[PDB]
Design a protein around this ligand. Structure first.
Ligand code: CLA
Ligand code: CLA
Ligand code: CLA
Ligand code: CLA
Ligand code: CLA
Ligand code: CLA
Ligand code: CLA
Ligand code: CLA
Ligand SMILES: CCCCCCCCCCCCCCCC(=O)OC[C@H](COP(=O)(O)OC[C@@H](O)CO)OC(=O)CCCCCCCCCCCCCCC
Ligand SMILES: CC1=C(C/C=C(\C)CCC[C@H](C)CCC[C@H](C)CCCC(C)C)C(=O)c2ccccc2C1=O
Ligand code: SF4
Ligand code: SF4
Ligand code: SF4
Lengths: 161, 741, 41, 73, 73, 132, 61, 80
């Protein structure tokens, strides 16, 4: 397919890996009695291994010659579940964290003792501000348009050139 | 007059100061203006003498903090007992100590980490643990997990008691300084009470509980059939069945016919053939004799009854024609400086840990310890590291004494004064000794590598060539081998088989056999002498040049810990005694690393291994130490490269955590070099550009970011260096030893 | 109780609690939804 | 190849960062605004102002040599 | 193998040298008035943005490359 | 007029004989122990004391210590091998930290530190920017 | 420029260059740097006050 | 010998003079500041270059500057 790869549900090496992993787990399980907690734990590991291999098989994941899933991250939507959608989630979460941190720092910058509020967090203000993170991109846009996001150079210290 | 003086309600109990970080320091109390404040807060937290100028307050803080440490230690011991009681295969291991692998840690099934639950035997999966808990518990007479649960419960109770005692003796009943300055009474109590009564009571446990239980367990009795421990107390007939002299009772003890107790108080020496450990009857006799010795020692000093010695008098009398006033002033130093006492006590405790490591390998005290090669390696290595750190700390606190608590007026023409007066001679001669040792000891190896590379094996320093036999060590070994019949006539066997004798075999594995010393042992022992001498050079230079030097005449005014005195005079970086501790730590790491590598390779090559019933010995690494350890190439190939196989091939097995930790320790060790090789000017300049980017978006902390201080840069670099190197050796040793055990 | 709450509001205590909570929810998500090599389910 | 190439890019970027910061701060910085009066190579500016070890541009060269060696490795 | 390694190490040394001599030029030869408002001076004018963005790129590459290697391990 | 001192290995070397030596004198009002900068403790004499040292910095460290004894009359000299003496400290009979008329300013530049010329502007002149 | 005035710093070698401080006092005796300015943040030496000439300061509103 | 320069931002606080371990600096009369005195370095032949004077100076940027130069016995702090 892409890059001369093949679907893991069509890869002989992938299925060989599944069989090998299950066989080693069951060989370990064969040393105990059927009702021993080691045996039950090993058989649950076997089930989880089989479920994982099956989940990768039913997915769109592609596989190289080694029989391991490879990720496609050139921007195609047909593989968006591998980089694009997780990337969307990460950007959303990280922007939330950063926006609420910046907002809290700017809010306590005008308190009686700004430095004290950085080592001893005002928890009520922090929780209130953290709950506002979900609209961080809209807030960021409004801050950018209203000239509150970006400062002027004349107001920022620099060293002699 | 030895009296108890206590002030009541000394300090209020309140959470106010918990909300005022840095309250203990006048400067740090004003609050942070830069991130440096934060680091300073942790650095000065337990520096009590800088938080107050009253010695009584420092003593009170130290006493309560000691209680806190005791509470933590009890919590740790209680946790180990609880994990033995609920997450171990101790019961199964009791039935077959030889084939079942000891395990007292279990991991939860998450993200695949359950692979770490090894197939250790006994219908149990977990991590193979190497701290020796099962052997110790079996030696104590513990046969059930319920006994372990009760020991853990008591550990929790004692931890709470220590915590309350610390709170009580800081906040409710704080002793006066006059109470603390009771060296005579403290020595009397700690010798006679703590050490003497401790030994006597432990001997009581061993005689009454541990001895009969182990005699039964060795005889092949099942743990589920052995009588409960209190039955041995309430049934003198039960003991009379095992040790017949108990049928006479205590009549011989008070009659003086102590020979009657020869059946349970012995002097056998050697090892128990079934267990591979010391005879428990020898250990009981040992603890009883020690208890007597300590109780005697605890009546030497005068407290309240006229009789006894005054330490100051004894010290003052010991002076000669070479030493001026001699030991005068030492008593005042050791009763007014906590740093002087800590220097002595850290030096002693570290040296004792090293001694413990040696003695515990050569005379394995617990049953089935000797053939648990993983446990033996881990215990030796752990106690070596602890000892190295403690000796270096003793040096550091000696330097702190010199800077802060040394007064010229109280040390005129005494031993300390005269040492300071010939520091140049001392340091120059130690420097020369270090060069001589290093050149010769390491040049042996370099010469050998060059000769072997040039195809000239007959020109090497080796057994098969120019020989360097450790004849003095061999002479001592022969003397100790001949001791049992002649110079220790009542000993039935040698103190340790390492000196000579038969091979002690347990479950087909070698517990101990004679450790022969040749040219390779000569070379490695002189390497040890070299590394120790260099470490002493660095630390003694730090102590003797702590106050002053020809370079910086007023060092004491700069303090114990300062980065430098500027780039002048050619450059004065790392002239402080703290920097001498910093460099000595690297050298101690080098020394201990070599010592533990010597142990690992020598034991694998010449001691540990299998032994057929016929008598054929197969050592773990096939006796390659003698011809491979005499070159650096042999260490790189036959020790590191070869024995790293287990740690690097561990992926996909229960040992994979060791491969991961091996890699992570390499990573942290390399990460430390960024701090050690660089300087804070660069980092502060980079932080300026980063602060610019934050300011360009209208936000920046009022706690201004700062690169670490010079001294903190050094401290961080060294801490990560030690963590990385030691953790690498840790993973490597543990994977190797779990494979070979 | 105000002083104890202010101690709990200090930076290290709050970071320890917050990172423990975050680690806990990551662990639980991986306990109930393991082996997510991408959003495939 | 993908992962090793991103490692190589890390090495190139960090080596460049050290060298570029050394060149661009060679004349001065907030910590040492008059650095140009002291030359390209000088030990430090002493323990004052928090400490100034490895502040010169030569020191940036010295730090970047380690990163160049690591990257080429 | 020897030829590739030899030439790559020499290239690294040459690149480090190029930046060292750029820094030396800035200390010893650069005249702000002769270069007033030119591209060379404007590099100095936005050195903070340049260094901060190079730092961001380095941190991103390091975090994610090391993270992917460790996850795989 | 030497203080009571049993000697040490930290004292002066051949340089004191062939290059230069330093001497510090002072008046004490009682016998008191002090710390030798070269290592060890010595006993000041009641009256005048004289001490020889290898470096000026050692003499000044000792004088700083003497100040803690309330002793302010110490004088510091340099002695050359020929026997010529230089009176060094306090140079004019007044401590340098106390402003004194008749002293002339040395090495002042009449501008803030940020106004030194650019290096590229004085190339091949043999001068530095801080000296021009 | 007077006492309590807020000023922007024009001295390039200053830690507070381009930043805002408050004029505490201005000496009226003919000294070279008469205006004493306090800042809310410390420099690398831990100080938060400095003396300036009047052409090194700009009033801000 | 090292070079020690005093710039006119000096406020005559006398801290550099008290910090100097080798007595290089002294206070001299001057009408440029409120304190009526300025630092001076008449004895740079004895300067070791420790930069304690710079550490002590309260102005921003420094009013006393030590530039290290030609080394002598005195500037290297040699007892030999
Ligand atoms: C001696 C030290 C010690 C150590 C290193 C361990 C280690 C372990 N124990 Mg053991 N244990 C110990 C003592 C110890 N224990 C003691 C004394 C007891 C008796 C109470 C036990 C009883 C016990 C049981 C019953 C179990 C364990 C288990 C475990 C394992 C999982 C722990 C875990 O993840 O919990 C969860 C960890 C957390 C919830 C982390 C919370 C951290 C807090 C929030 C931060 C605290 C910081 C500070 C104090 C608070 C400041 C803020 C505050 C004021 C609000 C781990 C190997 C488990 C196990 O082995 O499973 C197979 C298990 O089931 N332990
Ligand atoms: C960070 C510090 C540290 C840690 C984590 C450990 C950890 C361990 N130690 Mg070690 N130990 C240390 C420092 C440390 N040690 C130091 C500094 C010394 C020198 C005194 C020792 C001497 C030592 C001995 C002799 C033994 C251990 C043992 C152990 C293991 C079992 C733990 C236990 O509860 O045994 C409990 C300890 C015992 C049952 C024996 C204690 C016998 C000693 C002689 C008691 C001394 C107490 C005395 C009052 C101390 C004062 C000394 C005096 C001169 C003033 C465990 C791996 C034991 C082991 O290896 O078991 C398999 C073991 O037998 N350690
Ligand atoms: C014979 C009575 C006795 C005993 C058993 C002890 C025991 C101890 N004292 Mg000492 N002490 C005594 C008399 C005694 N002291 C007297 C008379 C004075 C005044 C001169 C002191 C002044 C003193 C100071 C200033 C300090 C100690 C400390 C210690 C502890 C040392 C650390 C250690 O190795 O503990 C090994 C651990 C154990 C043995 C665990 C059991 C602990 C319990 C509480 C022992 C008592 C049980 C017994 C049945 C009663 C140890 C618990 C140090 C300490 O850590 O205090 C907190 C310490 O700093 N003591
Ligand atoms: C009996 C043991 C003992 C005691 C009571 C002390 C007590 C003290 N030491 Mg000493 N010291 C000791 C042993 C001891 N030391 C040893 C063994 C060494 C050699 C390493 C030293 C070397 C030393 C130096 C060089 C200095 C001191 C200093 C001090 C004082 C300040 C302590 C402080 O505030 O640190 C606060 C405690 C911390 C900041 C914790 C540090 C954490 C360490 C660095 C790493 C821990 C690693 C961890 C175990 C592993 C984590 C792994 C994981 C992350 C993967 C205090 C009086 C300082 C002083 O100024 O004295 C007046 C000082 O400069 N000590
Ligand atoms: C492997 C790297 C390495 C080497 C070779 C050295 C070597 C030395 N260190 Mg150093 N050290 C090191 C790492 C190293 N260190 C690191 C990483 C640190 C940072 C922690 C330090 C920090 C440090 C301190 C604080 C001190 C030392 C000291 C020493 C010297 C110890 C005295 C001695 O044995 O001289 C003998 C020389 C050798 C052992 C090297 C090789 C000897 C050869 C093989 C035999 C003789 C050959 C002969 C000269 C012929 C040469 C032929 C040639 C002309 C072609 C020795 C020169 C100490 C010192 O100077 O004490 C006097 C000292 O105090 N080092
Ligand atoms: C930090 C975040 C966090 C979150 C969101 C959860 C969420 C959950 N936990 Mg978990 N747990 C956590 C941390 C967390 N835990 C910690 C720190 C520990 C100590 C190791 C545990 C130990 C634990 C146990 C023993 C159990 C849960 C269980 C649960 C589930 C209970 C559902 C319910 O009945 O309401 C829920 C999914 C229960 C469960 O999953 O039952 C099947 C359950 O029995 N948790
Ligand atoms: C820094 C690079 C990096 C990246 C991108 C990943 C990514 C991943 N790791 Mg890896 N890993 C890393 C570093 C990294 N890790 C490191 C440094 C280690 C050593 C500690 C590991 C060790 C490791 C193990 C042992 C495992 C992973 C697993 C995973 C997968 C977890 C899926 C998941 O939990 O989503 C769901 C969880 C979330 C999305 C958390 C957020 C939940 C909130 C509530 C969502 C709210 C959104 C609105 C994910 C692909 C697991 C896996 O399944 O691999 C396929 C797995 O078992 N990692
Ligand atoms: C292998 C060792 C090592 C590592 C990992 C680093 C890492 C770094 N160097 Mg350093 N450096 C090193 C050796 C190393 N260096 C050496 C030997 C020197 C010569 C002195 C230098 C000299 C140097 C200079 C001059 C510069 C760097 C810079 C950097 C950063 C580059 C950007 C980056 O990759 O961010 C990614 C971060 C990492 C890869 C490190 C984080 C590691 C893990 C992933 C974090 C895990 C955190 C953990 C969860 C929390 C702790 C757990 C527990 C204790 C609580 C990075 C932090 C530059 C910089 O600052 O750029 C911004 C820079 O200018 N280094
Ligand atoms: C084998 C162990 C290490 C040996 C190292 C060197 C082997 C050389 C032989 C030296 C042993 C005898 C020393 C003199 C004999 C001795 O024991 O003391 C004899 C003598 C004691 O004099 P007094 O009779 O005045 O002593 C009164 C006492 O009460 C002390 O107050 O000490 C001196 O003359 C000065 C000691 C410094 C002498 C320096 C000699 C070189 C020392 C080497 C470094 C020692 C390393 C040990 C450090 C822990
Ligand atoms: C890298 C390095 C630095 C820079 C490193 C610094 C400033 C340490 C940064 C520590 C961080 C900020 C604390 C731990 C925080 C985590 C890394 C991230 C969490 C962020 C918030 C939750 C606080 C020095 O300052 C330094 C100084 C002297 C010699 C060598 C060096 C040195 O090598
Ligand atoms: S500032 Fe750094 S480089 Fe300069 S002398 Fe001090 S420790 Fe050395
Ligand atoms: S650098 Fe040191 S010796 Fe020189 S003038 Fe300054 S304080 Fe005095
Ligand atoms: S140079 Fe600095 S320290 Fe010296 S008097 Fe002037 S302002 Fe004070």
């Amino acid at each position: 397919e892409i890059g001369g790869l093949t679907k893991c549900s069509e890869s002989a090496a992938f299925t060989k890996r599944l069989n090998a992993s299950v066989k080693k787990l069951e060989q370990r399980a064969s040393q105990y009695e059927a009702d021993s907690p080691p045996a039950l734990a090993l058989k649950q590991q076997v089930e989880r291994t089989q479920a994982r291999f099956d989940k990768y098989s039913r997915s769109e994941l592609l596989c190289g010659a080694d029989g391991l899933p490879h990720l496609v991250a050139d921007g195609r939507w047909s593989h968006a579940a591998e980089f694009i959608l997780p990337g969307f989630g990460f950007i959303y979460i990280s922007g939330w964290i950063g926006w609420v941190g910046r907002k809290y720092l700017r809010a306590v910058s005008t308190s009686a003792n700004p430095s004290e509020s950085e080592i001893i967090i005002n928890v009520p203000l922090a929780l209130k501000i953290m709950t506002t993170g979900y609209i961080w991109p809209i807030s960021a846009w409004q801050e950018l348009i209203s000239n509150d996001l970006v400062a002027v150079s004349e107001e920022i210290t620099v060293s002699p050139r | 007059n030895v009296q108890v003086f206590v002030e009541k309600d000394a300090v209020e109990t309140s959470f106010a100061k918990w909300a005022q970080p840095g309250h203990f320091s006048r400067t740090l109390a004003k609050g942070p203006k830069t991130t440096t404040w934060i680091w300073n807060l942790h650095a000065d937290a337990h520096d009590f003498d800088s938080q107050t100028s009253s010695l009584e307050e420092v003593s009170r803080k130290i006493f309560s903090a000691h209680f806190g440490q005791l509470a933590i230690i009890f919590l740790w011991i209680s946790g180990m007992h609880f994990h033995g009681a609920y997450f171990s295969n101790y019961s199964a291991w009791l039935t077959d100590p030889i084939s079942i692998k000891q395990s007292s840690q279990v991991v939860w099934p998450i993200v695949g980490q359950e692979i770490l639950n090894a197939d250790v035997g006994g219908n149990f999966q977990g991590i193979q643990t190497t701290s020796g808990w099962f052997q110790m518990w079996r030696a104590e007479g513990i046969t059930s997990e319920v006994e372990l649960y009760w020991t853990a419960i008591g550990g929790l109770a004692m931890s709470a008691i220590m915590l309350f005692a610390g709170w009580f003796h800081y906040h409710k009943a704080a002793p006066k300084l006059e109470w603390f300055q009771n060296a005579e009474s403290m020595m009397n109590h700690h010798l006679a009470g703590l050490l003497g009564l401790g030994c006597l009571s432990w001997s009581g446990h061993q005689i009454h509980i541990a001895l009969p239980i182990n005699k039964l367990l060795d005889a092949g009795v099942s743990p589920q059939e052995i009588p409960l421990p209190h039955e041995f107390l309430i049934n003198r007939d039960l003991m009379a069945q095992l040790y017949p002299s108990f049928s006479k009772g205590l009549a011989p003890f008070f009659g003086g016919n102590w020979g009657e107790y020869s059946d349970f108080l012995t002097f056998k020496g050697g090892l128990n053939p079934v267990t591979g450990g010391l005879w428990l009857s020898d250990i009981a006799h040992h603890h009883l004799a020690l208890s007597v010795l300590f109780i005697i020692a605890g009546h030497m000093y005068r407290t309240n009854w006229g009789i006894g010695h005054n330490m100051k008098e004894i010290l003052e009398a010991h002076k000669g024609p070479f030493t001026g006033e001699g030991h005068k002033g030492l008593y005042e130093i050791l009763t007014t400086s906590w740093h002087a006492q800590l220097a002595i006590n850290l030096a002693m405790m570290g040296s004792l840990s090293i001694i413990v490591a040696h003695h515990m390998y050569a005379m394995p005290p617990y049953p089935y310890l000797a053939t648990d090669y993983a446990t033996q390696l881990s215990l030796f290595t752990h106690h070596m590291w602890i000892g190295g750190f403690c000796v270096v700390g003793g040096a550091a606190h000696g330097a702190i004494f010199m800077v802060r608590d040394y007064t010229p007026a109280n040390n005129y023409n005494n031993l300390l004064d005269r040492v300071l007066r010939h520091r140049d001679a001392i340091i120059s001669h130690l420097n020369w000794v270090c060069i001589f040792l290093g050149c010769h000891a390491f040049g042996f190896y370099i010469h050998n590598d060059t000769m072997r590379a040039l195809g000239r094996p007959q020109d090497m320093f080796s057994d098969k060539a120019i020989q360097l036999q450790p004849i003095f060590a061999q002479w001592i070994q022969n003397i100790h081998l001949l001791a049992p019949g002649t110079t220790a006539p009542n000993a039935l066997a040698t103190t340790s088989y390492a000196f000579g004798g038969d091979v002690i075999e347990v479950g087909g594995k070698i517990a101990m056999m004679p450790i022969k010393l040749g040219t390779a042992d000569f070379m490695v022992h002189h390497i040890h002498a070299f590394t120790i001498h260099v470490t002493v050079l660095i630390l003694l230079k730090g102590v003797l040049y702590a106050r002053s030097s020809k370079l910086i005449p007023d060092k004491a005014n700069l303090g114990f810990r300062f980065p430098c005195d500027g780039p002048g005079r050619g450059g004065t970086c790392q002239s402080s005694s703290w920097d001498h501790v910093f460099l000595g730590l690297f050298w101690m790491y080098n020394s201990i690393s070599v010592v533990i590598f010597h142990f690992s390779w020598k034991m694998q090559s010449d001691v540990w291994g299998t032994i057929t019933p016929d008598g054929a010995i197969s050592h773990i690494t096939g006796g390659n130490f003698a011809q491979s350890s005499i070159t650096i190439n042999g260490w790189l190939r036959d020790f590191l490269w070869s024995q790293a196989s287990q740690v690097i091939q561990s992926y996909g097995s229960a040992s994979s955590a060791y491969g991961l930790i091996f890699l992570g320790a390499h990573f942290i060790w390399a990460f430390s070099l960024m701090f050690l090789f660089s300087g804070r000017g660069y980092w502060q300049e980079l932080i300026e550009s980063i602060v610019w980017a934050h300011n360009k978006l209208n936000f920046a902390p009022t706690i201004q970011p700062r690169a670490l201080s010079i001294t903190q840069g050094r401290a961080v670099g060294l801490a990560h260096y030690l963590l990385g190197g030691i953790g690498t050796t840790w993973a490597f040793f543990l994977a190797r030893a779990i494979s070979i055990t | 109780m105000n002083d104890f709450q202010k101690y709990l509001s200090t930076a290290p205590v709050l970071l320890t609690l917050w990172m423990t909570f975050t680690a806990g929810f990551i662990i639980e998500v991986n306990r109930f939804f393991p082996d997510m090599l991408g959003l495939y389910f | 190849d993908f992962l090793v190439h991103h490692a190589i890019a890390l090495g190139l970027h960090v080596t460049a960062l050290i060298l570029v910061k050394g060149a661009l701060d060679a004349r001065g910085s907030k910590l040492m605004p008059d650095k140009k009066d002291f030359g390209y190579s000088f030990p430090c500016d002493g323990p004052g102002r928090g400490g100034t070890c490895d502040i010169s541009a030569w020191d940036a060269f010295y730090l970047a040599m380690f990163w160049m060696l690591n990257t080429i490795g | 193998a020897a030829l590739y390694t030899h030439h790559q190490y020499i290239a690294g040394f040459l690149m480090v040298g190029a930046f060292a001599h750029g820094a030396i030029f800035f200390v010893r030869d650069y005249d702000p008035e002769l270069n007033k408002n030119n591209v060379l001076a404007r590099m100095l004018e936005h050195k903070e943005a340049i260094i901060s963005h190079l730092s961001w790129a380095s941190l991103f590459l390091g975090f994610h490359t090391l993270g992917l290697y460790i996850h795989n391990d | 007029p030497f203080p009571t001192f049993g000697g040490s290995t930290g004292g002066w070397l051949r340089a004191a004989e062939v290059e230069e030596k330093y001497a510090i004198t002072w008046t004490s009002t009682k016998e008191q122990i002090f710390e030798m900068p070269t290592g060890g403790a010595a006993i000041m004499r009641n009256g005048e004391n004289l001490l020889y040292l290898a470096r000026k910095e050692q003499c000044l460290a000792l004088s700083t210590q003497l100040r803690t004894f309330k002793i302010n009359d110490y004088k510091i000299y340099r002695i050359f091998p020929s026997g010529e003496v230089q009176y060094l400290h306090p140079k004019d009979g007044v401590f340098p930290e106390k402003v004194n008329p008749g002293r002339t300013s040395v090495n002042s530049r009449g501008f803030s530190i940020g106004k030194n010329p650019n290096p590229a502007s004085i190339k091949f002149s043999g001068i530095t920017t801080y000296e021009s | 420029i007077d006492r309590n005035s807020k000023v922007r710093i024009l001295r390039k070698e200053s830690y507070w260059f381009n930043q805002i401080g408050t004029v505490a006092t201005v000496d009226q005796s003919g000294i070279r740097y008469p205006a004493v300015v306090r800042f809310e943040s410390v420099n690398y030496a831990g100080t938060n006050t400095n003396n300036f000439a009047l052409d090194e300061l700009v009033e801000v509103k | 010998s090292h070079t020690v320069k005093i710039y006119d931002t000096c406020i005559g606080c006398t801290q550099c003079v008290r910090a100097c371990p080798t007595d290089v600096l002294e206070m001299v009369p001057w009408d440029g500041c409120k304190s009526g005195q300025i630092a001076s370095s008449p004895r740079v032949e004895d300067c070791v270059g420790c930069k304690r004077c710079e550490t002590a100076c309260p102005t921003d940027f420094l009013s006393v500057r030590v530039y290290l130069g030609a080394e002598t016995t005195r500037s290297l702090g040699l007892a030999y």
